[PDB]
């Protein structure tokens, strides 16, 4: 499923807040947030 | 009783009201420095644990 408007879903129904993306922290289990595509680094 | 169990009682987890007696007492700052020193009995919840 999908998470709410204030949550960004990484993978496998685990979502983090919008400010928690590209903030030097792999909060998610799949670490999809800091990937070169979403972060660009 | 300021040191036993109910020295900080709040009616719910986010209540604006808060009852708390802790025997707080203000002391004189000394020798020409700026600070606010106080004195109170330690926590009753910590003593309960």
């Amino acid at each position: 499923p999908t998470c709410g408007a204030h949550e960004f879903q990484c993978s496998t129904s685990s979502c983090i807040p919008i400010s928690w993306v590209c903030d030097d922290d792999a909060d998610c289990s799949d670490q999809s947030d800091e990937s070169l595509e979403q972060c660009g680094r | 009783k300021a040191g036993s169990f109910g020295d900080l009682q709040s009616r719910t987890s986010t209540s604006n009201d808060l009852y708390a007696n802790t025997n707080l007492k203000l002391q004189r700052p000394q020798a020409g420095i700026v600070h606010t020193p106080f004195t109170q009995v330690p926590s009753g919840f910590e003593r309960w644990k």
Binding site: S19, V21, C22, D23, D24 | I33, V34, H35
Partner: protein
């Protein structure tokens, strides 16, 4: 974003406040330990100072 956690911290500055026992004689220092918090479960504490990191 890393910048989202520092939007309100750019408006703040360090300050010099007194603290006892720099060396021997209770200095006025840029580092001033205020409100040490030690209520965790493995000896991890949080220290608030006057400097900005």
């Amino acid at each position: 974003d890393l910048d989202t956690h520092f939007t309100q911290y750019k408006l703040a500055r360090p300050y010099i406040a007194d603290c006892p026992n720099c060396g021997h004689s209770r200095c006025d220092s840029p580092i001033a330990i205020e409100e040490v918090r030690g209520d965790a479960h493995a000896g991890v504490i949080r220290i608030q100072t006057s400097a900005m990191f």
